[PDB]
Structures are given as structure tokens and as C-alpha cells.
Homo-oligomer: A and B are copies of this chain.
């Protein structure tokens, strides 16, 4: 790997610089190099990893959606034939997206998840696993689509089971996991009622536990709770 010669600490330092410079591809490459050193990641380091790849794939997803919409319009009655170029370029973007998702999944499988024993680390990685299978599912149209969707579901479910046993209802990781799994239900699994029920119960259970928190923890939890509320408002 091209980062093999760079110190772990220098990779982390450079990932933080890359973030400041909004150079998210570089940030992701640095954090991939840091993961591949083989040591477990701290909380801060897990956050750098997640932010880098979230931003890289987020941009790919937005571009894929623009291209897929143009491609759909091209297949409507009365649309002039323009050749294979729209499909080819959507395929190009799609293949690069799938590559990034496979790279993240590969870091999680080799060997972040298996070394993560604390609930906060293990839930965080399993959530990432669900998220990157969800991004694969968004673009899947073949023989494996069902298996891809099930992979996402299984990862999210294991994370949920741990989170409910080991974390308080206000814990930001528990909250973020639930937010995303609720979106999975709505957008991927064709289960809007499940999505709504999960978002509502998560919100309500968190609300009831806010009284136990410091001001700073309250801020963290309520920020994510508002995203649950935002989704519920969109869906109801």
C-alpha cells in the first residue's frame, strides 16, 4: 500500500489536515493507511475514518443520482436516442462507488470488527458495515441485490442488539445507528412503518433519558434527536 512507509501518527496528522482542506479523498487514503497499520482505532480516529469515507461516497452517490435521473429520462417515450454514453458514464461512477464501498467493507472485515470488543467501537463499525452495504444496495439491480440488502440488515441488527444492551438510549452512537437503520427500512427494505416506528421509539426513549445528562451530552444527543424528528416529519 502506498501509505505503508508513512508512520501511523503522521497518517493521522495528515488526515486531520486533509479534513481542514476539505480534501476528503486524501483524508480517506490516509485513514486507510492508518487502519492498515493493524492497531485498533481510538474514538477520534474512528471518527476520522468515518468522516472521510462518508464524504467521498456521499459525493459519488449524489453524482450517481444525477446521472441515473438523466438516464431514466432518456428511456421515456419520445426521448431522442443519444447512444450509450449516459449509461456508460453512470456505470463508471457506479463502479467507482462500489469500489469505495468494497474498500471500506474490506477494512471493517480485515480486521476492525473482529478486534472491536467494547460496545462503542463494535457498534460504530457494525453501523458502518450496514451503511456501506446500504450504499451498495442503492445501486444494485442484479442476482445479488437481495443478499446485499440482507447484509446491510444483518450488520445493522447486530449493532442494534449490542446498542440496546450496552448503551443508554441517549448515547450518540446508539442514536445515529437507529437513525440510519430507520432510513434503511424506509428506502431500501420497503418498510416505511418499521422506519417510522423505529425513529419514534428511539426519539421517545432518548427524550426520557435526557435528564441524566450534562449540558454537553444533552447537546450531542439532542442534535441527533432532531434528525430523527426531521425524518419523521418528512415521512408523516
Instruction: Spell out A's residues near B (CB within 8 Å).
Output: 10, 13-14, 17-18, 20-23, 26, 62-63, 66-67, 70, 82-83, 85-86, 88-89, 92-93
**B10:A63 contact, CB within 8 angstroms:** no
**A17:B83 contact, CB within 8 angstroms:** no
**A14:B89 contact, CB within 8 angstroms:** yes
How far does the alpha carbon of A5 sit from the alpha carbon of B85 in the complex, in Å?
A: 13
Query: In the complex, how many angstroms separate the beta carbon of A173 from the nearest chain B beta carbon?
Result: 30
Q: Which chain B residues lie closer than 8 Å to A89 at the CB level?
A: 14, 17-18, 26
With contacts A17-B70, A67-B17, A70-B17 taken as known, whether A23 is within 8 angstroms of B85 at the C-beta atoms is: no
With contacts A63-B22, A70-B20 taken as known, whether A14 is within 8 angstroms of B93 at the C-beta atoms is: no
Interface residue from B21, B62, B66, B83 paired with A10 (Cβ < 8 Å)? B83
How far does the alpha carbon of A217 sit from the alpha carbon of B66 in the complex, in Å?
A: 31
How far does the alpha carbon of A17 sit from the alpha carbon of B66 in the complex, in Å?
A: 9
Interface residue from B14, B17, B23, B63 paired with A21 (Cβ < 8 Å)? B63
**A14:B63 contact, CB within 8 angstroms:** no
How far does the alpha carbon of A132 sit from the alpha carbon of B89 in the complex, in Å?
A: 29
Q: Which chain B residues lie closer than 8 Å to A88 at the CB level?
A: 14
**A93:B21 contact, CB within 8 angstroms:** yes
**B67:A21 contact, CB within 8 angstroms:** yes
Q: Which chain B residues lie closer than 8 Å to A23 at the CB level?
A: 63, 93
How far does the alpha carbon of A67 sit from the alpha carbon of B83 in the complex, in Å?
A: 44
Query: In the complex, how many angstroms separate the beta carbon of A147 from the nearest chain B beta carbon?
Result: 29
How far does the alpha carbon of A170 sit from the alpha carbon of B82 in the complex, in Å?
A: 37
How far does the alpha carbon of A108 sit from the alpha carbon of B86 in the complex, in Å?
A: 29
How far does the alpha carbon of A234 sit from the alpha carbon of B147 in the complex, in Å?
A: 59
Q: Which chain B residues lie closer than 8 Å to A26 at the CB level?
A: 89, 92
A-B contact pairs, 19 of them (CB 8 A): A10-B83, A13-B82, A13-B83, A13-B85, A14-B85, A14-B88, A17-B67, A17-B70, A17-B85, A17-B86, A17-B89, A20-B66, A20-B70, A21-B62, A21-B63, A21-B67, A22-B63, A22-B66, A23-B63
